[PDB]
Amino acid sequence: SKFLKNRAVVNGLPVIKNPGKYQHCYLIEYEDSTNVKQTPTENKNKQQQGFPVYLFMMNPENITYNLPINYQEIAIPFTAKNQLNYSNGGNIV
């Protein structure tokens, strides 16, 4: 689809360099997202050691992101359209 793709938007996206090895995703405790492995081997007695909570053996084949935005409907009689009132944004699943 490289003949129909909008070149205007593609050229504005950042270019990413291919890394060295096959990367595996993981789950890490939050506020540990910026630490780097203070020790060679996990010491659970201490905290903020920068070790993943769970290491994926195999990367996911696909990842789905869902975001509903909470708007509210007000049905006023004898109106061609309902009133939509913004309620909130919602969490990404």
Binding site: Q72, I74, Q83, N85
Partner: peptide, 29 residues
């Protein structure tokens, strides 16, 4: 949404002088 509740209603529509006095004393001054 802001909701309003209004409770309203309709009001219904539409002698010369006294007799006797105690005796006085008058003193010119």
């Amino acid at each position: 949404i802001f909701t309003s509740q209004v409770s309203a209603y309709i009001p219904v529509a539409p002698s010369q002088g006294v007799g006797k006095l105690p005796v006085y004393e008058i003193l010119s001054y």
